Design a binder for this molecule. Sequence first.
Ligand SMILES: Nc1ncnc2c1ncn2[C@@H]1O[C@H](COP(=O)(O)OP(=O)(O)OP(=O)(O)O)[C@@H](O)[C@H]1O
Ligand SMILES: Nc1ncnc2c1ncn2[C@@H]1O[C@H](COP(=O)(O)OP(=O)(O)OP(=O)(O)O)[C@@H](O)[C@H]1O
Ligand SMILES: Nc1ncnc2c1ncn2[C@@H]1O[C@H](COP(=O)(O)OP(=O)(O)OP(=O)(O)O)[C@@H](O)[C@H]1O
Ligand SMILES: Nc1ncnc2c1ncn2[C@@H]1O[C@H](COP(=O)(O)OP(=O)(O)OP(=O)(O)O)[C@@H](O)[C@H]1O
Ligand SMILES: [Mg+2]
Ligand SMILES: [Mg+2]
Ligand SMILES: [Mg+2]
Ligand SMILES: [Mg+2]
Lengths: 290, 289
Amino acid sequence: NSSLGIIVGIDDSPAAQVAVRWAARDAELRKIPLTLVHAVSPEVATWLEVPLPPGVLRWQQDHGRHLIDDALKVVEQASLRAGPPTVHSEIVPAAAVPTLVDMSKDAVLMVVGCLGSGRWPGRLLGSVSSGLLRHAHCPVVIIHDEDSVMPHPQQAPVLVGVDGSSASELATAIAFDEASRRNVDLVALHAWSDVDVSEWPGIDWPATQSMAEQVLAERLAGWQERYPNVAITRVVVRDQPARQLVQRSEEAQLVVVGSRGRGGYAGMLVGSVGETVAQLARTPVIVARE
Amino acid sequence: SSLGIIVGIDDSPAAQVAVRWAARDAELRKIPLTLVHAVSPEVATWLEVPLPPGVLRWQQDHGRHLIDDALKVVEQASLRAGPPTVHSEIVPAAAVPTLVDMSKDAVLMVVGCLGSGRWPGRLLGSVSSGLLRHAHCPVVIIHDEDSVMPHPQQAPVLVGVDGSSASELATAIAFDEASRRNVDLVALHAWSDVDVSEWPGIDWPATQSMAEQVLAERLAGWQERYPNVAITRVVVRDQPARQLVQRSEEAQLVVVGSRGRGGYAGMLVGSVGETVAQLARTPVIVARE
Ligand SMILES: Nc1ncnc2c1ncn2[C@@H]1O[C@H](COP(=O)(O)OP(=O)(O)OP(=O)(O)O)[C@@H](O)[C@H]1O
Ligand SMILES: Nc1ncnc2c1ncn2[C@@H]1O[C@H](COP(=O)(O)OP(=O)(O)OP(=O)(O)O)[C@@H](O)[C@H]1O
Ligand SMILES: Nc1ncnc2c1ncn2[C@@H]1O[C@H](COP(=O)(O)OP(=O)(O)OP(=O)(O)O)[C@@H](O)[C@H]1O
Ligand SMILES: Nc1ncnc2c1ncn2[C@@H]1O[C@H](COP(=O)(O)OP(=O)(O)OP(=O)(O)O)[C@@H](O)[C@H]1O
Ligand SMILES: [Mg+2]
Ligand SMILES: [Mg+2]
Ligand SMILES: [Mg+2]
Ligand SMILES: [Mg+2]
């Protein structure tokens, strides 16, 4: 029903804080509810012959309430003026992924930090963001603890990766929708080849590039007509869409990609471009899920 | 298991040391070694134009060169007579679907962590990642700085135990592997899957002692099946992934399950299983049923 509006998962981490800032702005901008969720699993998680103390389950509730507390304070600083219509807040006694995945059935956007409290130097995606990226029933927004969310009005355009797939169409819709609402420009990018064609002999790229830029323009005709107020900038590159998007994300305020594409295989939950852009991009990333 | 040990080949440092490891293991178990390189002969494009038949021939020529190199690496890595059988296949399909299908007849599936498409930042390639989630047998992840050639290698085999059925499989291969290599085994258990540092009123020493007692109990039986492998039990507070990664520096092999006692329905690989696979400092076997 999408009545929950923009859900945002919360924990004790920088990413989650700046994730709230972003989720607040978008909920305000879109004029829809902003749900704040923090999950605490109350299941027995250790060997039964070694139980946990009773004073620990209550401590998590208090910790949780103290988090939501600060979160609600951040929702205020983030608002440009009005703030989102409804401002909803919850501490669910269940595991983070299962609860957030279930709640996404009634959400417009699902927003979480990319790394959480159990992070360390090596990792680049936590279990919550990862599971959400693979199972959510709505677009998932990944925020990094160095993303620029405070500045306004943000002039940086919206970058989107298109590849013709159905999952990519959804991503496009989101990209334009988000672009006009923010009143900024849109950069559509297509890598001719999904496969890395560095050593491929007898290509002749300059010839192929000119032909592609035309087909790109033809596919974006319906979208340009539907969104006359937003200025499209088409870019065709040879290959390596993930690495292309990640580098060009530095000159954009928001990157949008599908969760699937032309390639992949049976049983794949999230594509490698989707996953890689979400991990390495320098700005907020929206991974479109049906 | 007619295919024995399958190793996926591509042009990359990790894939090369993966072949070294696979060869040693296939030799050790005296089972077939199967080298596989997959080339996707089609590149779906918007123009809907097929590939110049000249390019299509080049990648067969490229696969041929990889195999030739790989076959030499196999005999360089063989300590004695090597694997009883060595096979190479060049399959005209995508790597993941190809390898996932072949894993139905493999004892182990060996691939590098990163491939020829690697670039700074990425920890796992699409093939290693897809194999971790989908393979029909245990998957071995090799890193390009993994020590494989030095022999004899007396470092222990490290295994993470959490009590789950998938963890039970991990234990099985950890002992099998340690037994065949004539080395010792370190079984590590983290009492809590989630962080516990800030939790009030624990009493760690008493909880640790009770846990160590249960660990020993579960490992009895394995010990009785494997009298010659000296077990070492380590019980830590929490953070099993970071603990395993840190302790891998002093093992020659780490074994974990693909799933644990946590997770959810639809999860293909646990966060500990994956994090160990990508951050560990030695070969990592991830157990799959
Ligand atoms: N308990 C939770 N409830 C709701 N959302 C959460 C919760 N924990 C984390 N999140 C969200 O997920 C984002 C990433 O946290 P995640 O837990 O996935 O990473 P991590 O803690 O570093 O890794 P891991 O949890 O696997 O040890 C956080 O920034 C936050 O937005
Ligand atoms: N060639 C491309 N050019 C521009 N964007 C792309 C390209 N390929 C994928 N994308 C973006 O990434 C999103 C997810 O596609 P992805 O390729 O990750 O899924 P997939 O093709 O099923 O997986 P894989 O390519 O790893 O086999 C696409 O919907 C699109 O938004
Ligand atoms: N074409 C292939 N055929 C067989 N095995 C492969 C093939 N490509 C990669 N592998 C195996 O997977 C390991 C990791 O490579 P992978 O391709 O997953 O990483 P990458 O190339 O950096 O990622 P990506 O292909 O998604 O850009 C390689 O070391 C190799 O063992
Ligand atoms: N607490 C632990 N102590 C020792 N080993 C562990 C522990 N947790 C996980 N492992 C190792 O990791 C393997 C995979 O389990 P993992 O925890 O990754 O899956 P899961 O619990 O189902 O998923 P998740 O932990 O993210 O909810 C286990 O089989 C075990 O070998
Ligand atoms: Mg966490
Ligand atoms: Mg793709
Ligand atoms: Mg590759
Ligand atoms: Mg676990």
